[model samples]
Target chain A: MKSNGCRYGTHRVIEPKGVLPQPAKILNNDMSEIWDNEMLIDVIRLNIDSASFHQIKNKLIAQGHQDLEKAFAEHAIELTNRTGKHKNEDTGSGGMFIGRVAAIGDKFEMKEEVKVGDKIASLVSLSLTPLKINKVKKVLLDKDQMEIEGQAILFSSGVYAKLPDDLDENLALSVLDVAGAPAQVERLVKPDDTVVIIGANGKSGILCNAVAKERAGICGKVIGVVRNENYIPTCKATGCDEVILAQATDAITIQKEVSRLTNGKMADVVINVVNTEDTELPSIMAAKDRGMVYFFSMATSFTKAALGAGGIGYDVDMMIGNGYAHHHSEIALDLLRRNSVLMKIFKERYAEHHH
Target chain B: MKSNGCRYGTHRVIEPKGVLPQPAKILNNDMSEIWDNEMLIDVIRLNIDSASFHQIKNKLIAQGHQDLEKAFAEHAIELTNRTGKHKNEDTGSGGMFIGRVAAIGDKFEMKEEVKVGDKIASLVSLSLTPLKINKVKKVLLDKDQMEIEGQAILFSSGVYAKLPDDLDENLALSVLDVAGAPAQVERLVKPDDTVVIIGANGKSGILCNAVAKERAGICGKVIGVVRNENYIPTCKATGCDEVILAQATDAITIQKEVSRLTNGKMADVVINVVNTEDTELPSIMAAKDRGMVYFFSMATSFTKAALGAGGIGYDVDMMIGNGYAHHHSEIALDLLRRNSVLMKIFKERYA
Candidate 1:
């Protein structure tokens, strides 16, 4: 039991190392003893990231397991039991959680106001957060969400958003899930910038489309590219300037379409949010010679993007979607409140209705 | 051309002496003169087969065609001029035509009503009939239809249906284009039999789904399988028992879904009407042993189906969609008229 804790939660690292808690081989998840600089959360629900959930589901399905719900619970139980976190070893990704503020240390410092009874969502990825799941009560497998009875500790540097009384709890969880994409694009996008959002109908992609358009004014164009034609209506409802039906996996085809749409001048900012591999090149190829390319999809391969860019002799700025930003949780909730179309879509797609 | 024409149109053969007009090296398309037992018609529009159109369109696009319509017009012009017919050399398939009867030979034995200037859709394949284009006017690239000022020769053996006054000419043309599918499925499907229609949202597929359900009766089940989910609403409106969203190209996945839907009983009759290739094995695998399997898609490879069936030791009756049968055209149009949902879909997608 340590009386003092590092601001980065280093005191919780149980392994032989000077590494921070996230990269440590193991973490001491002993909830009985509390450190002064940590805040404990009574974890209620965890919304698994689309990338990690998809990988885990496909991995088990590939192994010929048909009872997916039971298989997933077992895997989550095993991984969390061994590693003290919910990070999927195969995909190297995790999602966030929503819960009540169980306790806060006297020395715990947070940017947002918090109280013991306040309901909040952890903005930190479960990959780095300390989670102890006692039971998996409900599994919304299709939505990449779960209802679990667990406890998690946030470091003094952790970020979170209090659940809003005006919105549904599940809606708030969804808004905070990919909060960084919308919040980051708000600052990165500029007026008169032509933005291309691939996978524009997905949970994160749709939100990014709305934000990119808000930042890029009337003169700027927002093109939403969808791989499935069924999602054309959903993508179009995002208020993007244009919706394209094409295989975003096909780089040359998408590049040609982008060039044709832009009169041979490609996009200024291409944001990829598809939950699939091989979309890295299309995002890179669809952009201008010197433009911004952001890969928010965890399915992306860094080597592919790097090699592909150099092969084309293109000079462009690239950014990895760090699922974290300053005050990202608050910014995301505000976006839904401002955009009715986005709110409606989130309600239909993510909001749960109990029987 | 020759003075005496055979019933099967062998007299129109130019280079080959013993071969029929369709398989011959070249067809003698001399529209200026007419022979005995021959009927000449002023061709107005050509409704190309979906399979042939997809092949032609994809072939041109793969060859770096930026302006597809222009490339298509030029290619259609060149092919009709050389081969004397609308048969695509690469695809080896042709569609039917709608035209008015300009003249008829005295020896041309009449089976239907004899009349000049009667609007009719040729029930015969354009591959066998000789066609000459004077000018290309309208090219519906997406619809696989074209309006051409030309003439065509229907030999004595040729079959056709007089366009019904109540229906639109284009509607009749589209119905007669793949009329064989609906008509054939009517006879093959038994009451209370479970039917599976792959590519159930396409022009031919939609028609077959409606007819398969109608013939299967109250206790019967008809499952419509679609490759794209966008067409789910379209497929479901056909009154099928269920609509499955699946990649028909993926054999094992579709097989599993079909088994799941049928409680491991599998399909009694499997129909393949997809425009794309590689759906043969999935169709074959979805059917039960001793059940009927029909391949209506021109994109189907016979070798693949036969090899796959033998590999699995499946005992089934496989039928090659001949695109021909007795009174196929009238039967198809009648199907649309009987089923309002079928008519609506045909009016929107094919009718």
Candidate 2:
């Protein structure tokens, strides 16, 4: 099923003009038939529920059908690539997905370590989305703004993962071993430690605060720092010891407030879910000496800049990437797994998402 | 006597073309003179006893009348402030010093709660070195290489005189407590915990290492990292567990070695003495998770970068310059200082 004039798989670039058809006719599943019906199919089956796709879908819906139609037209015009075919055929594989390898193409050769039957899943598109198709000519014809919907599929891709050689696999798997061992590194809310969750009102921030409160116990403090004053009530409601109103930009002020709240002793562990270059320095400062500054924001400006450029942008990527990523999930899971209250909440929110 | 054309407080940038008379002619006084020559005239008065300087002086003396005259003309250039004025001058006077309320400047101000006649000292410098001066265009440089050198002096200077705040003022004062509040925040060095001493061969490094080793006792190990390998044998001789070669660029490799030696465990505390941007990364990497890193470097980089750059660097001028200086001499005078074995060798060789 094709939409407009953008055909799929070697039908050649053709402008049929006007709207082709709703659920345009699939002439046949064969190569030529698939090619012939492709031009009439402008929008393919989209995978929302993934954060980025959901955000994209919401923005498109908000823009009204007329704006979306214009966007599709512009995307078709810019779809041609250096090889003179639509760029979507190449770059459109960048969308979000959660699927195991169904099968490998016969001509596709695997790397030394990679096997065909690996339970690997990629967050990629099926050459469907207009923005991705138009991306070949470096154009984002989709008038939709890229929303930072929490935990987008882009967050987990391209990260290095493997077991370290330093530790015995079994033992390493049990503790915080240095070896690329498959184990979980988690933060348990312990007594006498104050946990400061920056960006507390945000999606991950709320979870971090809740988990920290559970670990910190009844006596330990859990302070949530948020930019909006309105977030203060939410923060306080979420078991935060104190709701401090301070933007990430005002680092010095934030530090000062945090120090005052903790009686000159700052946070034992500062978790930064607000990923931006602007927030990194302040987050580091907010942490007490000898305290762990956990960066939970997977796509910080540092990572974005690194992907765009290279190297550790601001000392966050100094550690192994896989360890860091797993550290996040493990830390969250540890609190939930250990504490009944947190476990209930975690299960209710995340586990019940599909249901 | 002015060397080449540069003279202290002179109108001409270079020393006057003729020889100045002997009444004011002074030889280098001591190691202290290297840090405290207020006027350009004092450089001539520098009394260096160290073998490094001793060799240079001896070679110059052997040059005879003719060779000495030519080398002075061709080699040495006048010290200037770009405008050709004698650059070295006292901009302010509060660093590691022990004094009873000498007159205070009219415009004197205190950022903290400072009082007149308060015997307070700061870790500030009067001027930058010629090399540093060349880089900065401004006549009055806020901080420079001299400040770093001055820090050691300020630390070494107050070894004799005891400040009122000195905990053991009645007893002969010895160790200068610059960065007073935090210096008291001491932790017992534990065995099995790796420790890296940046200026392992330096006075503070030696003292710190000694104290740490004493606290660690027989089970603990100390890795002394010094730039000069000549100090390697000396560091090892001082009962240091191991000696690692550390320079600006190669310190990272040394850090890696330290980690390897400790079986991938980071150092418990990376006590850094060298203050440079290059040292920043290695020092951060040197620490184990939740490991404490200390900075004793008084270099300009310390002040500029501060704690945000990783590790702690604070101004401890009083302890370095005056407090420690007064107490140190007093301890030596009383013969109460239980001197390390290496002290005598360094005293004989360098002092």
Candidate 3:
């Protein structure tokens, strides 16, 4: 059935033959119709929920868990089989996924201006879309994505961008999964502004740190905050001004260290990309009065950020993480293609088969 | 005797020749000089120390203090008779005074490009100048400057700006004294940003509130914070979007009110113009995370501002009040001349 101006109008109902988990229960027996301005996509790679997947991957690696690749594959297969979708029930939402356009709805016009068979990545959240996975060939643990042969659907309201040809496919996928972080950093950073990036060695943190360093110019300072000594070299490779080793959990200690490093002037912009909880105070205390704090982590609590700043009487501006920004995918991809060191870091840390 | 670039170069060192009281010690035995690039002027008006003068005037008015005019005259006479200078030793060093050029040194060139005999007000602090008053006429308590027919000297490095002919002489003097406050508001405020001005009823506060309102445009929100209900109408007359009644002492209560008013989004820029101490926390909490705070009050404590913000884990940018900003005097005067409502407010309160 061809529907006009309907939001969810694809014409096929795919019922889950078996029971699904808690949040994924809503996805069971969902009707599929190609609504006006919607597209039927053949999903190639499913980048799992970023924060949850990272925690799981890091834990598995720490435990010396054997067959990490098979483990990831099994996780993806079990999720798709139970929910009849690629959405992670644990994370409660779908992340960005890369795919090719299989078909376009009759009334669908190119919102992102892409054509059928052209490779693209959905810039919107993946939890809402109906995804069916037949088989998972390989699990790239480091990249946080699975090489899957699957099919998915895209709504008219959904946003997608054509994949850039300049970068390697896996590199592009890895960058796109966390594209919002760097783009926001690029948007917020001004020349001669002192920027502090908490959790500067992680995926989004590294990207944001590099962009902040580039944007802040020679007169500005980019201080990278890391949890442990292990990530210091990676943070330094981004060409940041200073690297401070401090755990995000202890706000006072981190505040003192950052305060000492900044000579009590504090930061003009503090970017929090730490994936841990109770990391609010350190980010708050590290900024100067009338400064800005960008919370790009899923773990960030608005209640904590609002009241925490209020409790201390600090007049800092706070920005929440929005996964899709204007042309964010292009910006993230361009950063990788332009900066060889960042590209190399991604290649080392996130490229498929790097280990 | 003639002197060179030495600080106290003038020859006649007038000695008190007698003992004086607590507020009169430093006024005794002061030298007079016409140092290099200095100007010898016939002083006309002596504006008292703003904070101290305001307190004295308010106290006097409250008690219906009789012989107020005589009281001012006696104070000025005693200081000048003892020191042979018009410097208010009671308040210590320099007050803004109006005068005409008596003589300009041969080496003196107008840094502000003003001429001799043209009426001017000294922009420099009064605590440092060598002043000698001849007679006191009348004291304008509301204006805080006394009418004086006296002689004073300006040091080589002393800054004085020519009073604009467009404004009432008193209005110009009042605006130029605290010129930095409004000029900073004009500089910092951007369109569509939420701005909060604490103490929006005082001299600099009124000026800043008007400037913030004008700069914030229609989309932006200008919240005027005042200590008492009496200042509410004055704040509203500035065309602020909202007028919040907040006491300067209670930080938490003010924060709650401001937070509730902003629906928890808080202000983008918070300006502290209150002439009161321990008001840092309200200014800090009133702003949004990553917001800006300007401390334009002499009473503001940097230690409190820095540590208070740190203690609460609030990330904000704090700016100290530098009394001199580029073209601040002119900008302030223009604001008064252009906005009649602000002019009326200034005339009613500050002028």
Candidate 4:
């Protein structure tokens, strides 16, 4: 479909550095069988390293990607080399703390929701001192010296098997994280506030239903929109306020139905976990005046530009272009962090599953 | 110029309560003239009669607005009587203390922006209380025999004259009261955020411009879109990042221009002081995803509704009508407060 054709250039600007090798022997075994706690921690940490925080920062800085660099710097921390008193102490467990925050430093800014003793985790690493001598490990500090990057490992060890059709825990947890399940359950929700969840039968859909039910408590309502009628009974059983069969593509129709159901008030919040561009418009349409629309689908056109760049070498005449692919990841991530329930879940789950 | 074949209900449902006549005499001609020697306080208190409180308690028991009517009854004195103490004890005021919060004795949540010690020389009564009360006067509540419907009063009193073309104190003060001005001045703006201003280049717009300039201090940008190009120089003089001409009945192009200038990054917040339905769609289009829209316009569509209701009833042949005359005040208000700056402006302005 040639829809107002616009020319695009073929350029390969960025590619993932192949520094970390795949299938390191330490991580090869089935996660469930490896009850060895230390081994699991090591493997998890290895996955974190795969993200390559230090390498990414250097590359981004070189490319003038200041925003991403700043983000990495903020998320990273430095360790003290020598042990001393409280007034002048230097402790050296200088690696990213993959577990939840047991305690906060006295100097941390206590903003809303981020309390003194919140379940938070950190990614700590050696401070990149330009010219310092490390006697213990003989760590170098010049441009030639290699710095170990910090990464957070999401260890999905015990919770791997597919959940039952009746109740899919994996999908639920992922959706809850993506949709910010815990926050919706605890604070973000209100009575008579309409919430519509797209993809009601899928794993994420089921979790959304569960979370919404938890959020609605006894008084709140959760509307689940699905494609198949068979899922209606399951949705109802999970305490969905309302269930309606809806094809994932027809968001406008879903919006109309939602408006009708809410007595023309429309949904206060519309969440789409389905992976499709068509879902975006409907979510916006379904929303009330001053309503919020959240897209949690990472699968559909996640890296539009990457896909576009990949197609460029072959010179596909009418493929999805780079402009279409540039989907404002930073803005999306910011919104998700601000509005969703997943950050809290990530903190909690990592804490419980890790240290 | 009937473009569409689609038909709609051409009937009008209700009549508007005509505009309340302006007070005949200005009780205080120099309302803005303040006495330097004596302290002046604007008090807003809700006074409910004991018997009226009893009736409300009984009604709540009948309709279940509350769980425990007995508890409410017992606490009625505490709820109604606390205003006086709150005013007197909260602020160390010794002068013309006009102490009345709401005409009806009602309980409401107050935020940090509101404090006891803060000056209340000029008060605007926009808050609505659900319960009924016998009477309301300026800012005081007194004991009465029976229950009666309560009315909210506009407590604000200030002098207004033409402001200077350049920065003026009165305009600055008006802009200071605008919701996002403080936040904007404090350099607390976020990305993917949109702000709108209706009647943007009016007297208040000048202060908004100055504050916006301060907000976009080092590496920030502000987009100013208005009807006239005459404001272009003013906007630029105020250090607006970009200015676009957005005339009435044709703001789609202007919206597109704003989107283009922001690299398609629409507005995060929109503020509207000009009240009009024609401005709604363009405002919505100009806003970025998850942006806030606020409207502060007070133009009611009563005159137009009057034309449709009976001034000229529709004929059978003319099943559908097309004009701005049939617009409802509620729809316009809804659209104004729907998204982007209007929503944020509403909260900051009133809520």
Question: What is the per-residue lDDT of model 1 for residues A199-241, given as tens digits with 9 covering 90 to 100?
Answer: 8989988898889888898888899998687888777677588
Question: Worst lDDT window (10 residues) for model 1 chain B?
Answer: B303-312
Which stretches of candidate 2 lie above 4 Å from their native place?
Answer: A1-189, A202-204, A233-239, A248-329, A333-355, B1-115, B123-188, B202-204, B237-239, B246-248, B251-272, B278-351
Q: Pick the winner on lDDT between candidates 1 and 2.
A: 1
Instruction: Using lDDT, give the best candidate's number.
Output: 1
lDDT of 4 by residue, B122-194 (tens): 2111111112222333222222122212322221111111112333332222332232222222232443234
Return the TM-score for candidate 4, rounded to 2 decimals: 0.29
How does model 4 score on DockQ?
Answer: 0.01
lDDT for model 1 comes to: 0.76
lDDT of 2 by residue, A1-355 (tens): 2323222121231222111111111111222222212211221212221223233334456776566544543433333222222122211111222222323323222322334333222212222112222221222233112111111111111121122243222211222211111121133346878888778875456656666776678888988888789878767766688988887645557778989998888877776655333454456556665455554432232212111111001111111112222343234434434545434443443331345
How does the DockQ of candidate 1 come out?
0.01
In terms of lDDT, which candidate is stronger, 2 or 4?
Answer: 2
Q: After superposition, how far is residue B78 of candidate 4 from its true place, in Å?
A: 77
Clashing pairs in 1: B346-B351
Which of the two candidates, 2 or 4, achieves a greater DockQ against the reference?
Answer: 2
Cα misplacement distance, residue B253 of candidate 1 (Å) = 54
What C-alpha lDDT, on a 0 to 100 scale, does residue A130 get in candidate 4?
Answer: 10
Question: Across residues A9-84, which tens digit of lDDT does each residue of candidate 4 receive?
Answer: 0010011111010100011122222211111121111111211333444544677765652433332322111210
- Flag the better candidate by TM-score, 2 or 3: 3
Candidate 3 or 2, higher lDDT: 3
For every prediction, compared with the true complex, DockQ reads 0.01, 0.02, 0.01, 0.01
C-alpha positional error of residue A308 in candidate 2 after TM-score superposition, expressed in Å? 32
CA displacement after TM-score superposition, residue A54 of candidate 3 (Å): 3.5
The per-candidate TM-score of the B chain, in the order shown, comes to: 0.88, 0.45, 0.80, 0.38
